[PDB]
Design a protein around this ligand. Structure first.
Ligand SMILES: [Mg+2]
Ligand SMILES: [Mg+2]
Ligand SMILES: [Mg+2]
Ligand SMILES: [Mg+2]
Ligand SMILES: [Mg+2]
Ligand SMILES: [Mg+2]
Ligand SMILES: [Mg+2]
Ligand SMILES: [Mg+2]
Ligand SMILES: [Mg+2]
Ligand SMILES: [Mg+2]
Ligand SMILES: [Mg+2]
Ligand SMILES: [Mg+2]
Lengths: 195, 215, 177, 205, 110, 48
RNA sequence: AAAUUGCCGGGAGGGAAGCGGAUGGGGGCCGGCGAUGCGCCCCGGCGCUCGGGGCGUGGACUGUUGUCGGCCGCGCCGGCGGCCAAAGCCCGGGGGCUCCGCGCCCCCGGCAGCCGUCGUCGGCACGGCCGGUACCCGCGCGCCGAAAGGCGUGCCCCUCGGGGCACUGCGCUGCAACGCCCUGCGGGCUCUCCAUCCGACCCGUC
RNA sequence: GUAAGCAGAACUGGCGAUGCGGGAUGAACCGGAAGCCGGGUUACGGUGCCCAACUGCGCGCUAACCUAGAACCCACAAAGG
RNA sequence: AUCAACUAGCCCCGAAAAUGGAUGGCGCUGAAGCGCGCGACCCACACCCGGCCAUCUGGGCGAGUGCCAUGCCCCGAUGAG
């Protein structure tokens, strides 16, 4: 945990260092596009096109106000493309990821949803993957790791609270005024009121 | 810093320091003592049919109820409930069981030294100097009821026989009131008008919004 | 304090292609409510002008412009293209405001009031601090005088906060401009 | 509109130059919350829209009558007190026991019949014409409407109000006299008590 | 007024019962709605949140020597931007209680 | 709290000038607008 | 037996009544509706049970408060990072406008007080609902302390203040304080009538 | 087919079999699917009264001497001045 | 300082039906209308936590101080017809 935190600040200073250096040297630095998405479903299980119903069943969003963590890649982001009217999604940061894992962390242990209230559950779900504590799980998700598949399929879909303070219109896209689709950085702003 | 207190308490080394395993490394050699098999009663008078459970000695040690920040020995308080609601009294000190101990004084308010729950009082921004008063004589046993037997039903014949007799608060509480009342009046006359103030009772006359009212 | 709009400048380019592996760079000055909305409007314009789509495009940077001197009043001009109910039109609107950002929000509200055009319909061609002695429009140019003076023909009476609000007030209010 | 919350036994309302709909919604919520109102000078209520618009509205209201028994259908009132009372009945659910008990608290009068002459008449700032209409829009007075609709007591109310107004002018001059003497009395006590009364100086004006 | 008879100190602010927590077609009798006299805004009811109230009515039969009755309750949370509160009582109020007075003391004070 | 040398000299003046120079250069390319010399029928309307 | 009718006593009624959910007001009815018994002791005879006193206690229901957890809402404050951060403030310099909103507009360079957005770290105060312990907590095996709690030794860190780490064992382990009433005009009821708010079209059927 | 609350087809969903919150009322429109309860927060829809929520903070437009105008389906109005 | 055309926002004309009549009603005119916003609030059997019922899955309990074993205890999800 000490070293994970140390590289969190190291990377956070490194981004500013690079951007400042690029401005200094004349050009500009393009930030590295996010490796991780947080997707949260915002529309209910009623009146769904069957292909969309399958998309959500595959993403593990089988109930309104569930949250899942997703790898970014052309396979999955074009899967979200097909189902954007039903999800709101974006780029989780460290606080959002860690406090989702702490306050709403459940593990798919033997098909049962075991609360992640102690370090020992991870010894059982993982440990063939060199993930031993909650902080290993948080790091190995956030910095999408060689074992992210297992450390996400271990996680149970986050069963989130209804958005405190309300929610804008769910009918439209976030760009047009609504809530579905990319809100790349602002899933962070939404999570503190889903959670 | 409640969180910092929690961490410092939860540290293993400081748990050692608190539970005092050292000085248990003093008595019983340089190693922690053994425990034994007590309770050799072997004399059960009666065998309960259901699974047996004995009585609890509560091993849990609740935190004392905390006093408000705006309460200092020497404040003038406002009673809220009971027969003395509205009376303005003086907070002497928080007695050991967790309740406030107040005085009228009894000469001016008719409120004796009495025990009042912290919930039902409001602090006032005023202070009196009560460095010179003796209170140590007060405790919980001073107020412990020793309620009599439930074989007495208060009838019509007792209704005013108790009033026309003095078999009531015994004379030493009477005597006590005199000493506290004197030793606190001497310091109440130092503050102007405070005698009239404590003689008055607090009323919420029309157009008075409590949340707007300071205290 | 909070501004409903912000003026960003967004730079993007096509993907590198092994023919012409250094694509040309496009910079645009956009108004939008936040970063993602600015970016999404940016790819709109490059798709309809430079034939560049986001999938075959790349975002280089989004930065937010702020105003030099929020404490000084500036005559602003906005050349804007909008869609009426029956076609498209080109307008010039002059405002006075301490920030271009506030002037743009003023313009969106004024368009939505005078012409029932919603924000999805308005394209801001050009913004320029058109200093005085060059403003073309009566409503702006009539405020260009020292020794300006006028009363408050219209002022609300209302308790300073909600706490003072009563239903019954024995005395008729005294209004005077 | 939540309700004043005042604890008065009755609240008397000087309905001169207030708006019919808004005065009536405020009063209706007072009545529903349980506060007894007495609206006086109901004949002076201002209504937005021209006198011609209100005329046309009220004659459309007149054509509405039950065909097979006219005495049964709409009851088209003419007095300003009754027109306001009907308006408030519009906002109160009058087909429930709560509704009829609500209207029971409502007493509406033309003018100010005693014992409401010797009573401070509270106005509702949420409905005054001065604060609710933009000066320059056409409006009308409920009394002038009802006169043109079939209320035959306009002259009587005018007579009673002119008498009441002069009778109150006399008393108000009496209270000017008493007030100047009491001003003299306040300074008589002020220059009689000095250091004994400094405490009121920083909270007096 | 002067030389009057009645309670000599009021240690409670009056309030009016106003209804129930209701949607357009439901009532939730568990929580009632109360208007405290003198409170006008959402922040100010945060002070009374907790201070218990009393519905004091009076029945037809005399019990324990009095017709007066008391049902007990407290201010749970604000209800809206205009100083209305939600009140929770030991046993749900009669529907006839809406419109009547309620005493709101300051017992659980601070 | 008692005015110790709380944040003191951190960077030399000579590069502290170039950093601000690069900042102003970026802001100039940030607020620069197009010349609008492509719209030969709307030159009068656009003002240039 | 019901349908149905009469009499007596009660109840309520502005063009239906009946029914569901809330309590409230009446009734009518419930003492397993609600307890007085445990431990310690001394006789006085019959270590054990009963008769007497002393003893610490203990009960249905209900109430308030405290403290721990859990969840939750709400308000206040502080620090940091990012932006070219700008700006006002203090100092400097450079342009264009020509009687002009004119002692005007624009721009750059120094500074060392407060002050937007985005991100983040933390502090506090109030309150709601549930829970009250065989495991997580907690208590004893030492002392001081009414108590919150303080107290040992050795190694690392800053070296002020103090901070971090450590050797670790046996056991035990259902949170408390005080009330109200106890045959009462009491308590509460799933029964009856009535009022009030909300809901509510008459069932079987094609 | 002139059009049809018309007849016949394609992909999907709904109703039928379904309550519940909103659209005043409506089988299929909008939200949403359900064991019984307490607490919190919401979706759609709104905050003048009926009716729980602001006569809240802003900016304009409209004056209707025709029932001014006021909810996706929707309960319509045109050509033209 | 002025003239003409063009254009589009609200409003007006265009605009006629039979029981009395329907922005849902009252009413509304620095709106309680129309267009765009900003806070907060109010509102489902929806979402989160907690109690309990049932179903389904997965477990523990014998040289038995041992159990309606068809029983008891534990974990997880779910509940429309
Ligand atoms: Mg809220
Ligand atoms: Mg919404
Ligand atoms: Mg849809
Ligand atoms: Mg029979
Ligand atoms: Mg009849
Ligand atoms: Mg019923
Ligand atoms: Mg009952
Ligand atoms: Mg707590
Ligand atoms: Mg069928
Ligand atoms: Mg609920
Ligand atoms: Mg309301
Ligand atoms: Mg025109």
């Amino acid at each position: 945990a000490e070293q994970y935190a140390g590289e969190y600040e190291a990377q956070d200073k490194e981004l500013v260092q690079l951007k400042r250096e690029a401005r200094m040297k004349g050009g500009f630095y393009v930030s590295p596009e996010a490796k991780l998405l947080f997707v949260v479903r915002i529309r209910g299980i009623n009146a769904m096109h069957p292909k969309t119903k399958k998309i959500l069943q595959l993403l593990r969003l089988r109930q309104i106000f569930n949250g899942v963590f997703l790898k970014v890649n052309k396979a999955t982001i074009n899967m979200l493309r097909r189902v954007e009217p039903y999800v709101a999604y974006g780029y989780p940061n460290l606080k959002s990821v860690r406090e989702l894992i702490y306050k709403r962390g459940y593990g798919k242990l033997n098909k049962q949803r075991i609360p992640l209230a102690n370090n020992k559950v991870i010894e059982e779900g993982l440990g063939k993957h060199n993930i031993i504590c909650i902080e290993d799980l948080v790091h190995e998700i956030l910095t999408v790791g060689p074992h992210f598949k297992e450390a996400n399929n271990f996680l149970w879909p986050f069963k989130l609270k209804a958005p405190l303070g309300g929610l804008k219109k769910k009918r439209n896209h976030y760009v047009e005024g609504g809530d579905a689709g990319n809100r790349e950085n602002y899933i962070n702003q939404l999570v503190r009121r889903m959670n | 810093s409640k969180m910092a207190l929690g961490i410092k308490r939860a540290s293993r080394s400081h748990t050692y320091h608190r539970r005092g395993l050292w000085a248990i490394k003093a008595k019983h050699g340089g190693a922690l003592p053994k425990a034994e098999k007590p309770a050799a009663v072997a004399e059960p008078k009666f065998y309960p049919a259901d699974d047996v459970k004995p009585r609890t000695v509560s091993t849990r040690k609740p935190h004392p109820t905390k006093l408000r920040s705006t309460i200092t020995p020497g404040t003038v308080l406002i009673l809220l409930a009971g027969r003395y609601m509205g009376k303005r009294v003086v907070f002497l000190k928080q007695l050991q069981s967790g309740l406030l101990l107040i005085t009228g004084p009894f000469k001016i308010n008719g409120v004796p030294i009495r025990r009042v729950n912290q919930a039902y009082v409001i602090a006032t921004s005023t202070k009196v100097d009560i460095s010179k008063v003796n209170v140590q004589k007060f405790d919980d046993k001073y107020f412990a009821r020793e309620k009599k037997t439930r074989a007495k039903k208060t009838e019509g014949e007792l209704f005013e026989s108790d009033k026309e007799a003095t078999k009531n608060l015994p004379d030493f509480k009477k005597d006590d009131q005199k000493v506290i009342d004197a030793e606190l009046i001497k310091a109440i006359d130092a503050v102007p008008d405070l005698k009239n103030y404590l003689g008055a009772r607090f009323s919420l006359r029309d157009g008075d919004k409590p949340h707007e009212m300071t205290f | 304090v909070a501004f409903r709009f912000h003026q960003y400048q967004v730079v993007g380019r096509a993907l590198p292609t092994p023919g012409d592996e250094q694509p040309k760079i496009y910079r645009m000055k956009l108004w939008a409510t936040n970063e993602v909305r600015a970016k999404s409007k940016f790819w709109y314009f490059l798709r309809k002008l430079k034939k560049v789509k986001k999938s075959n495009g790349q975002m280089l940077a989004i930065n937010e412009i702020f105003e030099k001197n929020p404490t000084t009043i500036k005559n602003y001009g906005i050349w804007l293209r909008y869609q009426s109910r029956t076609g498209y039109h080109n307008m010039y609107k002059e405002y006075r405001d301490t920030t271009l950002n506030g002037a743009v929000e003023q313009m969106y509200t004024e368009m939505a009031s005078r012409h029932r055009v919603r924000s999805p319909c308005i394209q801001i061609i050009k913004t320029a601090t058109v200093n005085f002695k060059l403003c073309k429009r009566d409503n702006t140019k009539q405020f260009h005088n020292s020794k300006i003076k006028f009363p408050l023909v219209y002022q609300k009476v209302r308790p300073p906060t909600r706490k003072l609000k009563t239903t019954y007030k024995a005395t008729r209010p005294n209004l005077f401009m | 509109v939540s309700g004043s919350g005042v604890c008065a036994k009755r609240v008397v309302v000087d309905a001169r130059h207030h708006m019919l709909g808004r005065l009536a919604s405020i009063v209706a919520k007072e009545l529903l919350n349980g506060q007894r109102v007495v609206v006086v000078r109901c004949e002076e209520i201002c209504m937005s829209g021209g006198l011609v618009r209100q005329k046309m509205k009220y004659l459309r209201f007149l054509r509405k009558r039950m065909n097979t028994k006219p005495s049964h259908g709409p009851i088209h009132f003419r007095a300003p007190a009754k027109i306001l009372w009907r308006t408030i009945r519009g906002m109160i659910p009058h087909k429930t026991a709560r509704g009829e008990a609500a209207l029971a608290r409502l007493k509406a009068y033309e003018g100010v019949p005693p014992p409401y002459d010797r009573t401070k008449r509270m106005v509702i700032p949420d409905a005054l014409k001065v604060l609710r209409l933009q000066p320059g829009h056409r409006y009308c007075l409920l009394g002038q409407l009802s006169k043109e609709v079939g209320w035959n007591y306009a002259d009587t109310i005018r007579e009673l109000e002119e008498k009441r107004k002069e009778k109150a002018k006399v008393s108000y001059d009496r209270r000017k006299q008493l007030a100047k003497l009491r001003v003299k009395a306040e300074k008589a006590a002020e220059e009689k008590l000095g250091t004994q009364l400094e405490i009121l100086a920083p909270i007096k004006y | 007024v002067k030389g009057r008879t009645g309670q000599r100190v009021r240690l409670y602010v009056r309030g009016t019962i106003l209804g129930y927590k209701r949607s357009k077609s439901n009532q939730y009798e568990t929580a009632s709605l109360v208007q405290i006299e003198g409170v006008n805004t959402r922040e100010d009811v945060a002070w009374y949140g907790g201070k218990r109230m009393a519905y004091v009515y009076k029945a037809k039969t005399k019990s324990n020597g009095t017709h007066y009755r008391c049902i007990w309750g407290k201010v749970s949370r604000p209800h809206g931007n205009t100083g209305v509160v939600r009140a929770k009582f030991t046993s749900n109020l009669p529907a006839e209680a809406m419109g009547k007075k309620v005493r709101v003391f300051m017992y659980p004070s601070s | 709290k008692e005015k110790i040398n709380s944040k003191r000299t951190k960077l030399s003046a000579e590069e502290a000038s170039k950093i601000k120079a690069a900042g102003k250069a970026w802001y100039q390319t940030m607020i620069s607008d197009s010349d609008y010399t492509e719209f030969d029928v709307f030159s009068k309307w656009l003002g240039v």
